[PDB]
Each structure stands twice: as C-alpha cells, then as structure tokens.
Design a protein around this ligand. Structure first.
Ligand SMILES: CC(C)c1cc(Oc2c(Cl)cc(CC(=O)O)cc2Cl)ccc1O
Length: 250
C-alpha cells in the first residue's frame, strides 16, 4: 500500500491548511458552542400535522449564520491553486454544486453523541428536530445519521479536507466547460487521499471503500437540499433569505 509521494504531501499540506483556515476552529468547537434554546423549534400543538412546514423562528436563526458558512466554503476553494485557475463560469457551477455537501460534512464531523446536537458555523448547537423543523426536513436526519456513523472513522483535518476537495472537483456538474481538467484534479486528490489513508493505517478493513460510501452520502444530501430549498421559498417569506443564500442555491 503506497504512501503519499513528495508532490502529494505538498498538495496535502495545501488542502489541509486551506480547510483549517476556513473551518472556524480557532478554538475547539465543543467549548465555544452555545446551545440553541430548546424552546426554538418546539411545536406548541403536538397533534397538528407537520407535513413539510417550516418553523419561521428557527429558520430565522439558521439564515443568520448560513451566510458566513457559505463564505468559508468559497474561501476554502479560493485557497486551492487548482481551483483558482478554472474559468469563473466553472468556479460558479462547482461552488453551487458542492456548497451544501461540504457544509453538511463540516456539520457531521462536529456531531456530539452526548447532547446529540450538531454544531453549526462552529458555534450553534442544534438538535435533529430543530434543524429538521427549521427548514431542512429529512435532510436534517440525513446529516445527523452521517454524523453518527462518522464518529468511528476518526477523520483528521486532512481526511476531512481531502473529502471536501473530492466533492468540489466533481466534473459531473451540468454546464461545466473544463470537465477533463476538473476530473484530473479530482484524481490527483483521490490518489493523495488513498495514499494518506495507507500512511494513517486505520484499524478497520476496507476503510477507503467505506469512506467513499460517505462521499456518495453527501452527494445525495446536497441534491436533496436543492429540492428542499425550493420548498423553503414557498413556506418562508422572501425577506428572510440572505442574498448570498439565494445566489448559491438559486
Ligand atoms: C434551514 C436552512 C436555512 C439551512 C440550514 C443549514 O445548516 C447548516 C449551517 Cl447554518 C452551517 C453548516 C456548516 C458549518 O458548520 O460551517 C452546515 C449546515 Cl447543515 C444548511 C442549509 C440550509 O438550507
């Protein structure tokens, strides 16, 4: 099992630092996180159909921190030379495509089995029901389920950073111009990722193949979020949507 080459180690240092610099982790999250009051997201009438409705109050707090979350995803990408040398038209398509896949991953790795909450933007700990009622619906469940199964993977800033790069460099997005050049960058990351996996020597058989399944989960989530955004537009007032939010998922 080949370990990373010299060139791969340099790339690895590039993504890892890119991720860390944009992951709102100056201080460990488990300490800076404030819990969103239990009241928020709580349904007063228990027997009233939930359907696909949205808690406006909860939705309100979420949109207030979604913009800085979206920006860090942009800043992360803009720290990778491979990405910056892609046409601006491709940079847009790629960002609108992986934004939620990377954000969901970033939330999932910050899952706390104790309180059973996800820490968003590195400071807001929410429960499954809060994020579910607040707008995401089933997508909330998808992310929590992912966070539950990621705990044993013990992913470091590098493994998480490489996962983001793989998600970012997806050439299957519609309208992309440099499909080949993007697919190549993705191969370069996948390769460095696997080699780094051999270097880490995790005590779990078929760790790489199990990791790739998680990558498929995030792509399913990001796509499900797309259809979910449309619904939010119907259930929630247009004034509550930040211009950055609209731009990335419109
Ligand atoms: C309810 C709606 C506004 C909404 C919330 C939402 O929750 C999140 C937020 Cl704010 C931030 C992150 C990433 C991070 O922790 O940096 C990750 C996640 Cl999952 C994602 C998409 C959405 O459309």
């Amino acid at each position: 099992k080949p370990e990373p080459t010299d060139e791969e180690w340099e790339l690895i240092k590039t993504v890892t630092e890119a991720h860390v610099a944009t992951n709102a982790q100056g201080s460990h999250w488990k300490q800076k996180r404030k819990f969103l009051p239990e009241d928020i997201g709580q349904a007063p009438i228990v027997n009233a159909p939930e359907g696909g409705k949205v808690d406006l109050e909860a939705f309100s707090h979420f949109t207030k921190i979604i913009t800085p979350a979206i920006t860090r995803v942009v800043d992360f990408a803009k720290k990778l030379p491979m990405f910056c040398e892609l046409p601006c038209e491709d940079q847009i398509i790629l960002l609108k495509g992986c934004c939620m896949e990377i954000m969901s991953l970033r939330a999932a790795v910050r899952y706390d089995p104790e309180s059973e909450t996800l820490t968003l933007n590195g400071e807001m700990a929410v429960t499954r029901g809060q994020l579910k009622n607040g707008g995401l619906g089933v997508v909330s469940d998808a992310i929590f389920d992912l966070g539950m199964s990621l705990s044993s993977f013990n992913l470091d800033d590098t493994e998480v950073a490489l996962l983001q790069a793989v998600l970012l460099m997806s050439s299957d997005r519609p309208g992309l111009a440099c499909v080949e050049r993007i697919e190549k960058y993705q191969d370069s990351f996948l390769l460095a990722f696997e080699h780094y996996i051999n270097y880490r020597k995790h005590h779990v058989t078929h760790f790489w193949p199990k990791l790739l399944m998680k990558v498929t989960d995030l792509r399913m989530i990001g796509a499900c979020h797309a259809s979910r955004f449309l619904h939010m537009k119907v259930e929630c007032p247009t004034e509550l949507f930040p211009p950055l939010f609209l731009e990335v998922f419109e």
